[PDB]
Amino acid sequence: PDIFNRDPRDHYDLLQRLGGGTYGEVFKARDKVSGDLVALKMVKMEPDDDVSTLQKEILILKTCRHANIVAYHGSYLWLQKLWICMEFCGAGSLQDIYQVTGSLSELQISYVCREVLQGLAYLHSQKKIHRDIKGANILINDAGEVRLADFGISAQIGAELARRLEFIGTPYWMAPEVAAVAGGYNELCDIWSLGITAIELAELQPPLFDVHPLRVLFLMTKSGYQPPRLKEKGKWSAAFHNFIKVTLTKSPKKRPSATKMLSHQLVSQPGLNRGLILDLLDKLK
Ligand SMILES: CNc1nc(Nc2cn(C)nc2C)c(C(N)=O)nc1-c1cncc2c1ncn2C
């Protein structure tokens, strides 16, 4: 039994608003019995949403589990709002972190990319394209563990239509074959997004972020679009530059899979562990 017809406040104390976007509004909350901290996400239900589809979406969240994806605990449906209870990730998103710390070290980025690649390899095996890989959608808990905030864009939830169309105002992390579809693309779009995210963690913004989103969207559709590169050449190793070159392969017919990317020297160098992130969180305190 799940998706209870009741106020989540009956079981949880709402402490503070953590943030939100097209995916919903997120709150810090505390289990009234055990005292454990959770994140409660509120998503408004649209008139064309149906609970038969909703039940199928929640079943995917319950069954599909991986160490690099934020765990689902349970859900509520109250006054046309779907409330999702999930694992609390105390440090917030990588964007919340780098806005305070500044750029991540190459080693710290290598660790984050290895963890995200593991989460992506899992989703792609379950035939799920994430389509929303970016620093704001990668969370860090108090143990320095890396978690994808969600499985990516929901295929059949009403509120997620705005998320599916969000690339119009924010196309910077999107693969060119996605922008230039207006025939097709596949799961390798998430590998390009990870490449852009790796530049974002290094430079505090994705490539061309200051260019109007509508101009970027059009530039990606044009023939001759050159994949971005790291700006400061002398700051990064040949292995990091090569990792960017490989993930940002323009043709998806030449771009490696999430599993293959795990064989890259950057993400298989020695000393990659959560201790690198605990050290990043030490700058915060
Ligand atoms: C605002 N989003 C989030 N915040 C969170 N916590 C947080 C944020 N801050 C600043 N500090 C804390 C402690 C947490 C969490 N699980 O702890 N989950 C999200 C979140 C949830 N679902 C989808 C998401 C999310 N994030 C992006 N997508 C696409």
Side-chain angles (χ1 to χ4, degrees), residues 1-228 230-284:
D2 206 351
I3 318 142
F4 281 86
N5 297 269
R6 77 153 77 225
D7 193 336
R9 288 176 296 183
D10 290 352
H11 299 321
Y12 295 95
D13 291 304
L14 278 188
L15 303 175
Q16 67 167 141
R17 186 180 180 273
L18 292 176
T22 57
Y23 63 84
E25 294 279 286
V26 185
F27 300 86
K28 184 184 178 174
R30 187 202 300 115
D31 195 303
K32 287 189 173 187
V33 187
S34 66
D36 282 333
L37 289 170
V38 305
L40 279 174
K41 171 174 72 218
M42 178 189 85
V43 359
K44 278 162 171 276
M45 223 91 279
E46 295 288 318
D48 303 291
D49 279 310
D50 72 284
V51 330
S52 297
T53 299
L54 180 70
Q55 146 89 327
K56 304 160 191 163
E57 292 291 311
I58 276 120
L59 184 50
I60 292 159
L61 297 180
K62 284 189 90 182
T63 62
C64 305
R65 301 226 169 269
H66 188 272
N68 294 117
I69 307 167
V70 170
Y72 168 85
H73 298 315
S75 57
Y76 301 85
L77 187 63
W78 185 244
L79 312 168
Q80 315 321 124
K81 285 148 211 297
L82 169 72
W83 285 89
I84 296 156
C85 182
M86 69 194 68
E87 163 188 10
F88 177 76
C89 298
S93 83
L94 284 170
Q95 187 180 143
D96 298 319
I97 299 163
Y98 68 63
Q99 287 169 333
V100 175
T101 69
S103 63
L104 269 68
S105 74
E106 189 182 305
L107 251 201
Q108 287 161 344
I109 294 165
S110 302
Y111 177 71
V112 168
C113 294
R114 187 193 75 185
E115 300 297 290
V116 175
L117 282 162
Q118 287 162 3
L120 285 175
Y122 175 73
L123 294 174
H124 299 169
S125 76
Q126 302 306 304
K127 290 172 203 75
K128 224 267 156 194
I129 299 178
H130 190 282
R131 243 282 270 113
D132 203 21
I133 299 287
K134 62 185 286 178
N137 298 341
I138 305 163
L139 314 174
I140 305 288
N141 67 18
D142 294 313
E145 294 173 315
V146 180
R147 312 266 190 268
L148 297 185
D150 62 14
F151 64 19
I153 303 169
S154 169
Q156 337 227 323
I157 281 166
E160 295 252 330
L161 179 56
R163 197 182 173 183
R164 287 191 287 270
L165 299 174
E166 225 185 345
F167 75 92
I168 300 156
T170 316
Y172 316 99
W173 290 260
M174 155 170 293
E177 73 273 9
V178 182
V181 89
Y185 65 92
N186 67 3
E187 69 278 6
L188 302 171
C189 69
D190 288 336
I191 302 314
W192 174 283
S193 299
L194 180 52
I196 302 296
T197 300
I199 296 168
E200 174 199 352
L201 297 181
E203 296 182 6
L204 309 182
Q205 70 185 43
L208 310 182
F209 193 56
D210 304 322
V211 182
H212 195 288
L214 292 175
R215 288 191 47 214
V216 174
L217 192 57
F218 171 61
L219 291 167
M220 291 188 276
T221 77
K222 284 178 87 64
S223 295
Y225 183 67
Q226 299 290 108
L230 286 155
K231 205 175 93 132
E232 281 193 318
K233 225 261 187 77
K235 185 162 176 183
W236 315 104
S237 76
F240 189 27
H241 276 114
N242 182 263
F243 181 91
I244 296 307
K245 187 183 85 163
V246 165
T247 59
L248 301 188
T249 292
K250 201 191 168 192
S251 164
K253 303 276 176 189
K254 295 176 92 75
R255 194 183 305 145
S257 67
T259 305
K260 187 57 195 180
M261 281 316 300
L262 293 167
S263 71
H264 196 281
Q265 174 196 348
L266 188 76
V267 294
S268 38
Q269 74 185 104
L272 291 189
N273 59 76
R274 64 183 188 88
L276 303 173
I277 308 309
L278 292 171
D279 189 25
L280 182 65
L281 302 177
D282 262 22
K283 280 188 75 173
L284 238 62

